[PDB]
C-alpha cells in the first residue's frame, strides 16, 4: 500500500516570539513516570532557602537596634561578611507535587552545562500541516522522592552513633 | 620443640627475641653471635 | 483549579512531538529574520523497511542537512511551557529524537574556524608598548 | 619543578593505612586560580573482624576535602542529591549485570542506611566538618558551599553542576572498586605521563 | 621516494632542521612567553571586579546615599625593559649593563583601569585610566 | 649489569 | 637481591639484618625456624611431609572452593539437588531433629585437590567445626565417593527453638546475618 | 545473586523470612513492599574465584597496533586467520600464563583460549 | 576547540546520558573532566589524529590516548607534559619520503624547516602516556623492512636513538661501549672542565 512508499514534507515555521516559553522536562526511565494517575499536580520555585538563606535571618534582624545603635548594626552585619543572599526565584530549581502531598514529589535542577554550541527544538503537529520548531528556553531532570516515612535529624545522629547496629535495621527502621 | 618427631636438641628460629623467651639470656648469647656470624661471613669476609 | 496547577491535557491526547539537536549556523540563521515566518522545509521520505530524514535550507536564508534519529526508549522526555499568563501547560511526549548534521566536511571547518576566531576575539592578550608611559 | 599530574584519578595500595585501597584525584580549577584540592577514596580493609565489621566486610569511605572525618561515600552523593540507592549505584556501577562489584558497593551502602534525607546529609557533612557548627542550617549551608567548590572543582565549580561531579565521583569509585577486584591495574607514581 | 640506505643522511637532516627552528633552551623561553602573553593578561581578567561604598557615611536618610566606586582592571600592557636613572630620565637597559652594575633586568608592567562611581544621583561616569 | 644473583 | 636460589626461603641478609641483630627489633622482617626431623622422619620424604602438615597453619578458607548460603524451610525439600541423596540418608535417621531445624542453610565446597594436599579428612573438618562451636553449628558431610565435597551447616536447633518462652524479640542478626558472621569467622580462624 | 532494587522506593531489598509461610521475601527496610525471592540464594562467595577471562575480554582489543598477532591460530567461528594474543592482563589472576586469543576482522569478535 | 569538536563529532554529554548506555560506550576525558562517551571510538580517534597532524583544531601538544581495554579516550591539552617528536609510519612504509629530505636540505632559500614537516604530518609529538599506545621501531629500515615477523603494525620510529641521551652525555664518543656508571660520571665531570 501507499505506507510502504509514503513521502512527507512540511513546512517549518519559527515565530519570533512566543507567549509561553518552551522547557524540557525529563523523567528517568527506571522511575516509571505514568500520566494516567496525574489527575493534577503542582510545580513551584523551591523554598529551601527558609532553612540556608531567608527567614533564617528573622529574628536577629528585628531585634530591635535603633539610633547610632541601628546604623552601626546594619553596617557590622554588612561588612562582617558579603551581604547575604535573598530570593531570586529564577535562578532556583523547581519543585513538583503530583496529586498534592498523596502522589509523588519530583525535583527538577537547570541543566548547569549551557549549549553554546547547540539548539533544541520541539516540532508539533498543527491543523495546517506545517511543523513549528520553538527554542528549548530550559532543560530540566525531574526525579521523585518516595513518600515514605523519613528518619528525623536528630534520631539519625542518634542511630549513626550506633554505627555498628548488630540488631535487625528493619525493625529499627518499624520503630520509627 | 614440643611437637612429636622435631628435635628438640638442634631446631633454632632467626629471631632472637623467640631465643631469649624460650631458652635463656645464655642461649640468646650463642644464638646473637651465630647470627652475626652469619651476616658477616656471608659475603666470605671474616672477623676475628 | 489554581495557580500552580499543571495542564496536563496535552499528555492526555498523548501530543507526539519531536527533539531535535541542531547546529549554530542553522539557528543564527533562522535568528537573523525570524520573522518572516518562513526557514526551510523538512522532508521525510519512506522506503519498505528503512527511512530517511532531511532538511533543505531556504534559498533566501542561505544566502542539505540530513538527519539522524536516535532511540528514545532509554528515557522519557515530555514538553512543558510556562505561559506569561502563570498558566503551566504540557505541550506532549517526546517520542522520537534526532539530530542534524552538516554536509560539508572539509570546507565546513572552514567555517567552524572562522567561528573559533570569532568567539576567540573578546579573549584579550599582553600588548607590547614600544615606549615607556610618560 | 616535577609535580604529580593534576585532575587524574590514581589508584594505590598502601599497607600501613587501614584503608586497603586508596584512590586519589587531585584537582586544580582549569590551573585559573586556587590551590590544588586532593579528594581521595579509600576501602577499609577487611583485616577489623566484629561481628557487624566482618559481615560488611570492605566498606568505602571519602575523605572530602575541609571535613576533618572521613565520610561515608553512599552520604555523599545522597548530599549531593542522588538519594536512591538505585540512583547512586547507577552512577557508580556503569553495567548493573555483573555480581561482584555490586556485592563491593553494598556494605557501604548498609553503613549509610539511616541517612536517606538530602538534608540530613548535608547536615552530617557539615556537623562532621572541621570548621565549627553553630546551627542546623548553618551546618547545611556551609557543607552544600564545601561540596559545590572545594571536593572535585575542575568538574565544577557552579553552575548546578551536581550531576557532573556525581559521575566523576562515581568513576572514582568505579576505579576503586576494580581495582579491589583486580580488574585494573594498580596506577604506578613513577611513570612519567603522571608527573607534569 | 622512498630513502633506502640514505637514512644517515636523511634523519641527521631532519635532526638539524629540528635544531635550527628551536633551539637548545626552547622550552623555558616558550614558557615564559606564554606567561607574558596569557597568563599575566588572564590572571588581571579573572581577578573580581573592586567593589566599595561608604558605611552609611553623613546618618542622614540613607537611600542607598553612600556612593558605591566600582574598578575593573583591563587590558595589561609591557614596555621594554628600562632601566631610570638617579635624575629620573628613563632608558632602555641592556643586559650587560645590567650584569656590570648590578641592576635586574625587569619591565613596566601597565594596566588599563576603569573606575565607575555610582552616587544614587541618577548619573554614573565611567572615568578611564589608561596604562596606570 | 650482570645477573640475577651477580651485580645488577 | 644477590642471594641465590639455592637457600628457596626469603632470607634477610647484609646491613638490614645487622640492623635488625643491633637493635634488637621485637618484630623481624623475615621471622624464620629451622626445624630438625628427630629420626625416621628426617629419613624418609613422606614422613618428613606428615610433620610439615603437622606445622603449617591451615584455615578453613584455604581448603574450601566455594561458600554459599541458602534458605530452605525444610531439610527433607533439599533445595539444591545435589544434596538429596546424603541429607534423606541422615534423615533416615535423623539426629538433632527433635530439637528443631534451622531454615537458614551454609553449604560449603571444598576443593579436593586442596584437601588431599594437605591430607584433611572430611570427618575430621566436621569434628573440629563442631568442637570449636559446640552444639551452635550441625554440620553435615558427604562420602568421600561423592565427586563434589559438601559441607551443610545450619543454626543450632536448639537455639532455632531458643528453649525459652519469653524467647526475647531482640532477634540478634535474625539468623542469616549471623550465618554470614559465622561463615566469615570459620574461614578466617578455624585453624584446622 | 544478583541484587534487585524494589519497585515502589527504588532502593535495596534485603531478604528476609516471614516465619508464618517459611517464605523467602526479599523486603525494603525503607518501604513495606515484600517480595518473594525465585532464586532462594543469598549470598554465594567463590573463594577460588575460577572465573572465566573470556567474559571479560573485550572484541575491541583486537585494534591495538602494541598487542602480538599471530596467524598460525585460525578462528574457530569465521577462520579469519589473523588473530591478536595477549595474556591474562589481569591482578589476581594466580599464576597463570595462558594467551587468550581474539580473532581480528571487523565484527566477528571471537575470544577463544587454547 | 576540542571540546566544540567533540560536541560536532556525535558525543552525547554526561547530562544528556542514559544511565544506561555508559557501559557500553567509550568515555571521554578531556584535561581530565569526562566530558561524555562515544559510541563509535576508533573512528573519532582517527579524526582527531588527522586533524592534529594537519593542525587544524587540535594543536600540535595536545595529545590523544585511547585505552582500548578500560573503554577510555583521554585527550590531555594540560601544560607541563613531556614531549619527543617522531616520525610517523604508515602501513609498514615511513612517511618521510625523498621529496621532504630534499627541500629540508635546501632549507635556505626554500624557508622549508621542522614546523613544515611537522603540519605536513610528516612527523609528531608525543608524550608518554600517548608512548604507551604506540609501537615504534628503533631504525626505520631494519624495523619497517619484511623479516621474519615480529611486528607488522609499526605505528611510530624513532628519527634517531643517540637522541634519548642529554646534552652533557652527548658529548662521550662511543656511549655505548662504556659501562654505565662510567657514563654517569663523565656527564658530572663535563659540567667541570675548563674552556
Ligand atoms: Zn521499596
Ligand atoms: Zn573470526
Redesign the interface.
Same mark, same amino acid.
Given at each position: 500500500g501507499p505506507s510502504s512508499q509514503n513521502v512527507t514534507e512540511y513546512v517549518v515555521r519559527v515565530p519570533k516570539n512566543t507567549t509561553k516559553k518552551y522547557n524540557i522536562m525529563a523523567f528517568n526511565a527506571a522511575d516509571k513516570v505514568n500520566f494516567a494517575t496525574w489527575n493534577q499536580a503542582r510545580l513551584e520555585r523551591d523554598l529551601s532557602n527558609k532553612k540556608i538563606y531567608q527567614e533564617e535571618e528573622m529574628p536577629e534582624s528585628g531585634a530591635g537596634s535603633e539610633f547610632?545603635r541601628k546604623?552601626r548594626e546594619?553596617?557590622r552585619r554588612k561588612?562582617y561578611g558579603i551581604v547575604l543572599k535573598e530570593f531570586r526565584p529564577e535562578d532556583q530549581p523547581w519543585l513538583l507535587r503530583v496529586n498534592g502531598k498523596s502522589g509523588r514529589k519530583f525535583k527538577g535542577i537547570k541543566k548547569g552545562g549551557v549549549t553554546e554550541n547547540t539548539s533544541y527544538y520541539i516540532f508539533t503537529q498543527c491543523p495546517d500541516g506545517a511543523f513549528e520548531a520553538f527554542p528549548v528556553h530550559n532543560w530540566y531532570n525531574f526525579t521523585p522522592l518516595a513518600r515514605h516515612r523519613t528518619l528525623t535529624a536528630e534520631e539519625a545522629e542518634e542511630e549513626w552513633e550506633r554505627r555498628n547496629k548488630v540488631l535487625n535495621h528493619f525493625s529499627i527502621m518499624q520503630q520509627r | 620443640l614440643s611437637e612429636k618427631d622435631v628435635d628438640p636438641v638442634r631446631t633454632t628460629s632467626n629471631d632472637i627475641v623467640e631465643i631469649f623467651t624460650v631458652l635463656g639470656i645464655e642461649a640468646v648469647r650463642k644464638a646473637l653471635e651465630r647470627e652475626l656470624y652469619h651476616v658477616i661471613s656471608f659475603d666470605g669476609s671474616y672477623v676475628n | 483549579a489554581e495557580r500552580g496547577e499543571l495542564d496536563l491535557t496535552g499528555a492526555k491526547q498523548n501530543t507526539g512531538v519531536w527533539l531535535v539537536k541542531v547546529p549554530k549556523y542553522l539557528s543564527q540563521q533562522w535568528a537573523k529574520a525570524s520573522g518572516r515566518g518562513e526557514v526551510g522545509k523538512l522532508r521525510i521520505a519512506k522506503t519498505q523497511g528503512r527511512t530517511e530524514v532531511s532538511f533543505t535550507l531556504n534559498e533566501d536564508l542561505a544566502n542539505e542537512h540530513p538527519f539522524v534519529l536516535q532511540s528514545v526508549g532509554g528515557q522519557t522526555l515530555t514538553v512543558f511551557t510556562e505561559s506569561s499568563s502563570d498558566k503551566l501547560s504540557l505541550e506532549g511526549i517526546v517520542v522520537q529524537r534526532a539530530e542534524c548534521r552538516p554536509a560539508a566536511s572539509e570546507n565546513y571547518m572552514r567555517l567552524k574556524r572562522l567561528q573559533i576566531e570569532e568567539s576567540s576575539k573578546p579573549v584579550?592578550?599582553?600588548?607590547?608598548?614600544?615606549?615607556?608611559?610618560? | 619543578q616535577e609535580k604529580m599530574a593534576t585532575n587524574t584519578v590514581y589508584v594505590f595500595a598502601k599497607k600501613d593505612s587501614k584503608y586497603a585501597y586508596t584512590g586519589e584525584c587531585r584537582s586544580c580549577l582549569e590551573n585559573?586560580?586556587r590551590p590544588t584540592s586532593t579528594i581521595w577514596v579509600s576501602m577499609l580493609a577487611r583485616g577489623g573482624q566484629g561481628a557487624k565489621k566482618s559481615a560488611i566486610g570492605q566498606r568505602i569511605v571519602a575523605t572530602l576535602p575541609y571535613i576533618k572525618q572521613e565520610v561515608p561515600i553512599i552520604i555523599v552523593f545522597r548530599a549531593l542529591g542522588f538519594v536512591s540507592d538505585r540512583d547512586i549505584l547507577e552512577h557508580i556501577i556503569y553495567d548493573f549485570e555483573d555480581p561482584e562489584m555490586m556485592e563491593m558497593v553494598k556494605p557501604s551502602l548498609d553503613e549509610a542506611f539511616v541517612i536517606q534525607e538530602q538534608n540530613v546529609a548535608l547536615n552530617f557533612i557539615g556537623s562532621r566538618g572541621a570548621k565549627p557548627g553553630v546551627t542546623k542550617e548553618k551546618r547545611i549551608k556551609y557543607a552544600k558551599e564545601v561540596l559545590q567548590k572545594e571536593m572535585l572543582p575542575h568538574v565544577g565549580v557552579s553552575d548546578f553542576c551536581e550531576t557532573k561531579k556525581a559521575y566523576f565521583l562515581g568513576y572514582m569509585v568505579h576505579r576503586l572498586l576494580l581495582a579491589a577486584l583486580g580488574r585494573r591495574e594498580l596506577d604506578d607514581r613513577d611513570h612519567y605521563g603522571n608527573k607534569r | 621516494?622512498?630513502?633506502?640506505?640514505?637514512?644517515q643522511?636523511?634523519?641527521?637532516?631532519?635532526?638539524?632542521?629540528?635544531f635550527?627552528?628551536?633551539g637548545?633552551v626552547r622550552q623555558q623561553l616558550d614558557?615564559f612567553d606564554?606567561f607574558?602573553?596569557?597568563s599575566?593578561?588572564?590572571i588581571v581578567?579573572?581577578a573580581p571586579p573592586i567593589d566599595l561604598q561608604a558605611?552609611?557615611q553623613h546618618?542622614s536618610g540613607?537611600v542607598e546615599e553612600p556612593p558605591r566606586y566600582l574598578l575593573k582592571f583591563?587590558?595589561?600592557?609591557?614596555?621594554?625593559p628600562?632601566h631610570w636613572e638617579r635624575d629620573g630620565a628613563?632608558s632602555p637597559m641592556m643586559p650587560n649593563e645590567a650584569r656590570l652594575r648590578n641592576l635586574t633586568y625587569s619591565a613596566?608592567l601597565?594596566v588599563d583601569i576603569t573606575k565607575t562611581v555610582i552616587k544614587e544621583g541618577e548619573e554614573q561616569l565611567q572615568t578611564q585610566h589608561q596604562?596606570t | 649489569i650482570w645477573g640475577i644473583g651477580c651485580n645488577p | 637481591f644477590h642471594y641465590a636460589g639455592v637457600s628457596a626461603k626469603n632470607v634477610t641478609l647484609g646491613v638490614p639484618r645487622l640492623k635488625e641483630l643491633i637493635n634488637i627489633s621485637k618484630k623481624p622482617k623475615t621471622p624464620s625456624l629451622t626445624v630438625f626431623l628427630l629420626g625416621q622422619s628426617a629419613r624418609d620424604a613422606e614422613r618428613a611431609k606428615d610433620i610439615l602438615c603437622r606445622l603449617e597453619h591451615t584455615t578453613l578458607r584455604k581448603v574450601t572452593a566455594n561458600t554459599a548460603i541458602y534458605y530452605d524451610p525444610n531439610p527433607q525439600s533439599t533445595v539444591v539437588a545435589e544434596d538429596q541423596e546424603w541429607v534423606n540418608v541422615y534423615y533416615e535417621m535423623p539426629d538433632f531433629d527433635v530439637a528443631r531445624i534451622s531454615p537458614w542453610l551454609l553449604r560449603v565446597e571444598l576443593d579436593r585437590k586442596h584437601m588431599t594436599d594437605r591430607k584433611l579428612t572430611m570427618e575430621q573438618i566436621a569434628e573440629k567445626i563442631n568442637a570449636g562451636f559446640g552444639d551452635d553449628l550441625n554440620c553435615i558431610f558427604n562420602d568421600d565417593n561423592a565427586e563434589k565435597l559438601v559441607l551443610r551447616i545450619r543454626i543450632m536447633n536448639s537455639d532455632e527453638n531458643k528453649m525459652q518462652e519469653e524467647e526475647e524479640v531482640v532477634d540478634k542478626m535474625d539468623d542469616d546475618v549471623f550465618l554470614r558472621c559465622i561463615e566469615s569467622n570459620m574461614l578466617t580462624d578455624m585453624t584446622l | 545473586v544478583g541484587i534487585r532494587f524494589c519497585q515502589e522506593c527504588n532502593n535495596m531489598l534485603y531478604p528476609k523470612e516471614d516465619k508464618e509461610n517459611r517464605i523467602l521475601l526479599y523486603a525494603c527496610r525503607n518501604c513495606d513492599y515484600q517480595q518473594e525471592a525465585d532464586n532462594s540464594c543469598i549470598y554465594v562467595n567463590k573463594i577460588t574465584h575460577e572465573v572465566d577471562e573470556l567474559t571479560q575480554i573485550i572484541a575491541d582489543v583486537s585494534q591495538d597496533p602494541t598487542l602480538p598477532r599471530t596467524e598460525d591460530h585460525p578462528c574457530q567461528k569465521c577462520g579469519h586467520k589473523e588473530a591478536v594474543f595477549f595474556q591474562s592482563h589481569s591482578a589476581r589472576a594466580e599464576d597463570a600464563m595462558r594467551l587468550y586469543y581474539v580473532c581480528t576482522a571487523p565484527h566477528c569478535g571471537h575470544r577463544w583460549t587454547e | 576547540p576540542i571540546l566544540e569538536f567533540l560536541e560536532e563529532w556525535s558525543m552525547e554529554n554526561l547530562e544528556e546520558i542514559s544511565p544506561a548506555a555508559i557501559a557500553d560506550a567509550t568515555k571521554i576525558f578531556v584535561n581530565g573532566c569526562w566530558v561524555g562517551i562515544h559510541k563509535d571510538p576508533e573512528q573519532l580517534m582517527n579524526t582527531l589524529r588527522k586533524l592534529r597532524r594537519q593542525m587544524d583544531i587540535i594543536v600540535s601538544e595536545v595529545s590523544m590516548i585511547r585505552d582500548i581495554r578500560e573503554r577510555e579516550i583521554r585527550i590531555y591539552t594540560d601544560?607541563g607534559r613531556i614531549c619527543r617528536?617522531l616520525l610517523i609510519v604508515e602501513k609498514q612504509?615511513?612517511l +618521510? %619520503?625523498? &621529496?621532504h629530505?630534499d627541500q +629540508? %636540505?635546501e &632549507?635556505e632559500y626554500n624557508n622549508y624547516?621542522?614546523?613544515d614537516?611537522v603540519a605536513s604530518g610528516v612527523?609528531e609529538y608525543i608524550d608518554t602516556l600517548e608512548e604507551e599506545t604506540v609501537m615504534l621501531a628503533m631504525?626505520?629500515?631494519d624495523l619497517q623492512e619484511k623479516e621474519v615477523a615480529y611486528c607488522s603494525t609499526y605505528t611510530h620510529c624513532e628519527?634517531?636513538p643517540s637522541?634519548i641521551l642529554g646534552?652533557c652525555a652527548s658529548i662521550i664518543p662511543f656511549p655505548d661501549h662504556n659501562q654505565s656508571p662510567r657514563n654517569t660520571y663523565q656527564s658530572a665531570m663535563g659540567k667541570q672542565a675548563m674552556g
Amino acid at each position: 500500500g501507499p505506507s510502504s512508499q509514503n513521502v512527507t514534507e512540511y513546512v517549518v515555521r519559527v515565530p519570533k516570539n512566543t507567549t509561553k516559553k518552551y522547557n524540557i522536562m525529563a523523567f528517568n526511565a527506571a522511575d516509571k513516570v505514568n500520566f494516567a494517575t496525574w489527575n493534577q499536580a503542582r510545580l513551584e520555585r523551591d523554598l529551601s532557602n527558609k532553612k540556608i538563606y531567608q527567614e533564617e535571618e528573622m529574628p536577629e534582624s528585628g531585634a530591635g537596634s535603633e539610633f547610632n545603635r541601628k546604623l552601626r548594626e546594619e553596617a557590622r552585619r554588612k561588612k562582617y561578611g558579603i551581604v547575604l543572599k535573598e530570593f531570586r526565584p529564577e535562578d532556583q530549581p523547581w519543585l513538583l507535587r503530583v496529586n498534592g502531598k498523596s502522589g509523588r514529589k519530583f525535583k527538577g535542577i537547570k541543566k548547569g552545562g549551557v549549549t553554546e554550541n547547540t539548539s533544541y527544538y520541539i516540532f508539533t503537529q498543527c491543523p495546517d500541516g506545517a511543523f513549528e520548531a520553538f527554542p528549548v528556553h530550559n532543560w530540566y531532570n525531574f526525579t521523585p522522592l518516595a513518600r515514605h516515612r523519613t528518619l528525623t535529624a536528630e534520631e539519625a545522629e542518634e542511630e549513626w552513633e550506633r554505627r555498628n547496629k548488630v540488631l535487625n535495621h528493619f525493625s529499627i527502621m518499624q520503630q520509627r | 620443640l614440643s611437637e612429636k618427631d622435631v628435635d628438640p636438641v638442634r631446631t633454632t628460629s632467626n629471631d632472637i627475641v623467640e631465643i631469649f623467651t624460650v631458652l635463656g639470656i645464655e642461649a640468646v648469647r650463642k644464638a646473637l653471635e651465630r647470627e652475626l656470624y652469619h651476616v658477616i661471613s656471608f659475603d666470605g669476609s671474616y672477623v676475628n | 483549579a489554581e495557580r500552580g496547577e499543571l495542564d496536563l491535557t496535552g499528555a492526555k491526547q498523548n501530543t507526539g512531538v519531536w527533539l531535535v539537536k541542531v547546529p549554530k549556523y542553522l539557528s543564527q540563521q533562522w535568528a537573523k529574520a525570524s520573522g518572516r515566518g518562513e526557514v526551510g522545509k523538512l522532508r521525510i521520505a519512506k522506503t519498505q523497511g528503512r527511512t530517511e530524514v532531511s532538511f533543505t535550507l531556504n534559498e533566501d536564508l542561505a544566502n542539505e542537512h540530513p538527519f539522524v534519529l536516535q532511540s528514545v526508549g532509554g528515557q522519557t522526555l515530555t514538553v512543558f511551557t510556562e505561559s506569561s499568563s502563570d498558566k503551566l501547560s504540557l505541550e506532549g511526549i517526546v517520542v522520537q529524537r534526532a539530530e542534524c548534521r552538516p554536509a560539508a566536511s572539509e570546507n565546513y571547518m572552514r567555517l567552524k574556524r572562522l567561528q573559533i576566531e570569532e568567539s576567540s576575539k573578546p579573549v584579550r592578550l599582553s600588548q607590547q608598548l614600544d615606549k615607556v608611559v610618560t | 619543578q616535577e609535580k604529580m599530574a593534576t585532575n587524574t584519578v590514581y589508584v594505590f595500595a598502601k599497607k600501613d593505612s587501614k584503608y586497603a585501597y586508596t584512590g586519589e584525584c587531585r584537582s586544580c580549577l582549569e590551573n585559573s586560580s586556587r590551590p590544588t584540592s586532593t579528594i581521595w577514596v579509600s576501602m577499609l580493609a577487611r583485616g577489623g573482624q566484629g561481628a557487624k565489621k566482618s559481615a560488611i566486610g570492605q566498606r568505602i569511605v571519602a575523605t572530602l576535602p575541609y571535613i576533618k572525618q572521613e565520610v561515608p561515600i553512599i552520604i555523599v552523593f545522597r548530599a549531593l542529591g542522588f538519594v536512591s540507592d538505585r540512583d547512586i549505584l547507577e552512577h557508580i556501577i556503569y553495567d548493573f549485570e555483573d555480581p561482584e562489584m555490586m556485592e563491593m558497593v553494598k556494605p557501604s551502602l548498609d553503613e549509610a542506611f539511616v541517612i536517606q534525607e538530602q538534608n540530613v546529609a548535608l547536615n552530617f557533612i557539615g556537623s562532621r566538618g572541621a570548621k565549627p557548627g553553630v546551627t542546623k542550617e548553618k551546618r547545611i549551608k556551609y557543607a552544600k558551599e564545601v561540596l559545590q567548590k572545594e571536593m572535585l572543582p575542575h568538574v565544577g565549580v557552579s553552575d548546578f553542576c551536581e550531576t557532573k561531579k556525581a559521575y566523576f565521583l562515581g568513576y572514582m569509585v568505579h576505579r576503586l572498586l576494580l581495582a579491589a577486584l583486580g580488574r585494573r591495574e594498580l596506577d604506578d607514581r613513577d611513570h612519567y605521563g603522571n608527573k607534569r | 621516494e622512498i630513502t633506502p640506505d640514505l637514512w644517515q643522511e636523511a634523519c641527521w637532516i631532519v635532526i638539524s632542521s629540528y635544531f635550527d627552528e628551536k633551539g637548545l633552551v626552547r622550552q623555558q623561553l616558550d614558557s615564559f612567553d606564554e606567561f607574558i602573553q596569557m597568563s599575566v593578561q588572564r590572571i588581571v581578567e579573572d581577578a573580581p571586579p573592586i567593589d566599595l561604598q561608604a558605611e552609611a557615611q553623613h546618618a542622614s536618610g540613607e537611600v542607598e546615599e553612600p556612593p558605591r566606586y566600582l574598578l575593573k582592571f583591563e587590558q595589561i600592557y609591557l614596555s621594554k625593559p628600562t632601566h631610570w636613572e638617579r635624575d629620573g630620565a628613563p632608558s632602555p637597559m641592556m643586559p650587560n649593563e645590567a650584569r656590570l652594575r648590578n641592576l635586574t633586568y625587569s619591565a613596566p608592567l601597565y594596566v588599563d583601569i576603569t573606575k565607575t562611581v555610582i552616587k544614587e544621583g541618577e548619573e554614573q561616569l565611567q572615568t578611564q585610566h589608561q596604562k596606570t | 649489569i650482570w645477573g640475577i644473583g651477580c651485580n645488577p | 637481591f644477590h642471594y641465590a636460589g639455592v637457600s628457596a626461603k626469603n632470607v634477610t641478609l647484609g646491613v638490614p639484618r645487622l640492623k635488625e641483630l643491633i637493635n634488637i627489633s621485637k618484630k623481624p622482617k623475615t621471622p624464620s625456624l629451622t626445624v630438625f626431623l628427630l629420626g625416621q622422619s628426617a629419613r624418609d620424604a613422606e614422613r618428613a611431609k606428615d610433620i610439615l602438615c603437622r606445622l603449617e597453619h591451615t584455615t578453613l578458607r584455604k581448603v574450601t572452593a566455594n561458600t554459599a548460603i541458602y534458605y530452605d524451610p525444610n531439610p527433607q525439600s533439599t533445595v539444591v539437588a545435589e544434596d538429596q541423596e546424603w541429607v534423606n540418608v541422615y534423615y533416615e535417621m535423623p539426629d538433632f531433629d527433635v530439637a528443631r531445624i534451622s531454615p537458614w542453610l551454609l553449604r560449603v565446597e571444598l576443593d579436593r585437590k586442596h584437601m588431599t594436599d594437605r591430607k584433611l579428612t572430611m570427618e575430621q573438618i566436621a569434628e573440629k567445626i563442631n568442637a570449636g562451636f559446640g552444639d551452635d553449628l550441625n554440620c553435615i558431610f558427604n562420602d568421600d565417593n561423592a565427586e563434589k565435597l559438601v559441607l551443610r551447616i545450619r543454626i543450632m536447633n536448639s537455639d532455632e527453638n531458643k528453649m525459652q518462652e519469653e524467647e526475647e524479640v531482640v532477634d540478634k542478626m535474625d539468623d542469616d546475618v549471623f550465618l554470614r558472621c559465622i561463615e566469615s569467622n570459620m574461614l578466617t580462624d578455624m585453624t584446622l | 545473586v544478583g541484587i534487585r532494587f524494589c519497585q515502589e522506593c527504588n532502593n535495596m531489598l534485603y531478604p528476609k523470612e516471614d516465619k508464618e509461610n517459611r517464605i523467602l521475601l526479599y523486603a525494603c527496610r525503607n518501604c513495606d513492599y515484600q517480595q518473594e525471592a525465585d532464586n532462594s540464594c543469598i549470598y554465594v562467595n567463590k573463594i577460588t574465584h575460577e572465573v572465566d577471562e573470556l567474559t571479560q575480554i573485550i572484541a575491541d582489543v583486537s585494534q591495538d597496533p602494541t598487542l602480538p598477532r599471530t596467524e598460525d591460530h585460525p578462528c574457530q567461528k569465521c577462520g579469519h586467520k589473523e588473530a591478536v594474543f595477549f595474556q591474562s592482563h589481569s591482578a589476581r589472576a594466580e599464576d597463570a600464563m595462558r594467551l587468550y586469543y581474539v580473532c581480528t576482522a571487523p565484527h566477528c569478535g571471537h575470544r577463544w583460549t587454547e | 576547540p576540542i571540546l566544540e569538536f567533540l560536541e560536532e563529532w556525535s558525543m552525547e554529554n554526561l547530562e544528556e546520558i542514559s544511565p544506561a548506555a555508559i557501559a557500553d560506550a567509550t568515555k571521554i576525558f578531556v584535561n581530565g573532566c569526562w566530558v561524555g562517551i562515544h559510541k563509535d571510538p576508533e573512528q573519532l580517534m582517527n579524526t582527531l589524529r588527522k586533524l592534529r597532524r594537519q593542525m587544524d583544531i587540535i594543536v600540535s601538544e595536545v595529545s590523544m590516548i585511547r585505552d582500548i581495554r578500560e573503554r577510555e579516550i583521554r585527550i590531555y591539552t594540560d601544560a607541563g607534559r613531556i614531549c619527543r617528536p617522531l616520525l610517523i609510519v604508515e602501513k609498514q612504509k615511513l612517511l +618521510l %619520503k625523498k &621529496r621532504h629530505i630534499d627541500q +629540508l %636540505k635546501e &632549507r635556505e632559500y626554500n624557508n622549508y624547516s621542522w614546523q613544515d614537516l611537522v603540519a605536513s604530518g610528516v612527523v609528531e609529538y608525543i608524550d608518554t602516556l600517548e608512548e604507551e599506545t604506540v609501537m615504534l621501531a628503533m631504525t626505520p629500515d631494519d624495523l619497517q623492512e619484511k623479516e621474519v615477523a615480529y611486528c607488522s603494525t609499526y605505528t611510530h620510529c624513532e628519527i634517531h636513538p643517540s637522541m634519548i641521551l642529554g646534552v652533557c652525555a652527548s658529548i662521550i664518543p662511543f656511549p655505548d661501549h662504556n659501562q654505565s656508571p662510567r657514563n654517569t660520571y663523565q656527564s658530572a665531570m663535563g659540567k667541570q672542565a675548563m674552556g
